[PDB]
Amino acid sequence: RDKFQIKQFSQTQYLQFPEASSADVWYIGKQIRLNTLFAKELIGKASRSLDLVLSWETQNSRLEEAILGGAAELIDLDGANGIYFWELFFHMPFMVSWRFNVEQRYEDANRWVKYLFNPFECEDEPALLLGKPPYWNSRPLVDEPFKGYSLTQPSDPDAIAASDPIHYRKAVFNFLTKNIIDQGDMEYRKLQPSARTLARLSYSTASSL
Amino acid sequence: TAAAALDVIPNIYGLAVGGSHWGAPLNAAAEIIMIKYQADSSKSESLS
Amino acid sequence: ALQVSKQSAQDRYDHFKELYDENISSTEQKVIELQSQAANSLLMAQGMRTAAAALDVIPNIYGLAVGGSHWGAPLNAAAEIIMIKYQADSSKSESLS
């Protein structure tokens, strides 16, 4: 028999990890994270508006780590909890826009797609938001990726559809470029000439993308 | 009001006193909340 | 007679813009809304469990005799919570029909 310090832990609740040279294959250190304080950062901002939640400046809010001997200078997309950021910062924004695109609500679908991407603005309020993304407004479309390694041996499109953000964001562009044309044809069909020809003001923006 | 009258005061007094039915109001709220649906989904039959 | 016959086709045609457009009105929208409003069937039952638990975790009476905890109350309540799902989903099927 034997025993190990897989144990209760101080105020940030993360549990003790039993070995610095790891309990497993590689030397990951005697450190782990579990819970998050994110709700205490969100409750205010989200009760003020949805439009503040779908701000890149809100997404960069701070947490704390000093009890394990580090610092959590922003909300980190860590795999034990990270999905709940993605679910909130992408999927809820997406399904509304998907329904509205179909149901003749094209400019309302645009008002939701404008939380992901903005090929119409160059003059936002934060100098860091003007600088860094710059066009993309949910940070997991740009924030720190790596490899895709440990799903390679059974590799499939079910793996590769989320290896990296670049092809995922180019798919947002493919949905957006359709949405202009899907409205343009509704001006050309069944109307009269000076309204039908107004569709060329849509085809001339689609052909600019 | 029946659930409240079965709660705010005891059922019995003596060597033993009590009988206030603790869960009665919250147990009643679910029935009040349920009743809305049978009416609105038959107002939909009226307006259909 | 050919000039007369034109109206047999023309009157059969030119009405139908009142049916290939304006195909919905505000009353037949409420015919959906009062079906789909059953989205609160996540909430319609939940005060059951807490009431049953409050009738169990502590006694009804104290004295020479103490007790009154209603043993079966939570498991008796679970069947009602489980039942409620069906009336909502089989009327979401009327909304989507």
Added chain:
Amino acid sequence: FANRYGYWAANQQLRMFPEIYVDPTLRLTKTEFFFQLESALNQGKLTDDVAQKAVLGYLNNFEEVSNLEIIAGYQDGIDIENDKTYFVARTRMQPYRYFWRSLDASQRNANSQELYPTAWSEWKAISVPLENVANGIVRPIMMDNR
């Protein structure tokens, strides 16, 4: 090669263009919460207002999940390394909800990497109507992968 033309070319192009494969109709494991967006959007003809009621109806629920507290974890009897290591957790605001989940400590890269992003599961709720406990002590255990 069971059926042939167009079906064969799709063997490559359904991997080689990810934008063909991306749709909201994912392999969803998140069934405990993702249904609670759709059941508000479950309407035949709708307007721009309805989405805000649907969104906030999810966002009320979301914060309770983010506040879940871990109570205990089952090590593999006496073994260590590459364990599934089941954990049990509950809501703090009332002791009403209990859940379990797990992780894949074998799923990694060797080149100074750690557990891979997919190597962690998602919470499942517990169905059995418990009402009395020894002061929050509920114990999970593994019975040859039951």
Added chain:
Amino acid sequence: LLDTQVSAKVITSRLSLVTQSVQQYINRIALNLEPGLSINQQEATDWEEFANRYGYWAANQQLRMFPEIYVDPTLRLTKTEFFFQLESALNQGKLTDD
């Protein structure tokens, strides 16, 4: 800003071509940031008022300038705790003065 090499059979007013040139330009400067100009966040909000055009533009004034067009019982109602209790009795398909 001119439709060269096309439209050999079409007829329209000169005002439409004049309009179309500026109409395209005020789209084009918001469509891309060459030449090197920029648009303030108010101006970049307010292309909402030329997204779709004829009749929609004139309504920007006349839907304020004639209040009788805007007045209907379909108000922004906050009184939902009681105003529904009038309608649920009037919720009938064919009815009488009683």
Added chain:
Amino acid sequence: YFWRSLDASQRNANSQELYPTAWSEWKAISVPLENVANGIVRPIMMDNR
């Protein structure tokens, strides 16, 4: 039981007071209360919750 509120900032300065729109309308309370300390129920504000 019900709650409501008012907008004490919404006014005109020229010897006017609170403007006609500057007052809200009653919302009912949903939670099934049955016992109280003799009518003493207390509302409070938690950073605009």
Added chain:
Amino acid sequence: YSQSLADTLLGLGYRSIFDIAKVSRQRFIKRHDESLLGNGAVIFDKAVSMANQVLQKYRKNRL
């Protein structure tokens, strides 16, 4: 001090405060030195209000 603005703001820069109905804030902020900008960041909270202050003085007359 205020007349030091009204000498040259009204001398050349703008004909009147009513012509500030042209602007957007970044357009207006760009043009001004420290002797304006250090005593000017409050202006559009009341001057754009001026730019809709004449509004009904020629329509309240509907009788």
Added chain:
Amino acid sequence: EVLADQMEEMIAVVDRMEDEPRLALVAFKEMSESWDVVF
């Protein structure tokens, strides 16, 4: 908890909040005859 002797007594429930929202704990207008509570 009411950290003073003999509950059942009418003592109201009150607050006079001023700093730190996560420490917005309640207050009571009496205990026994005059004295305060360590709460």
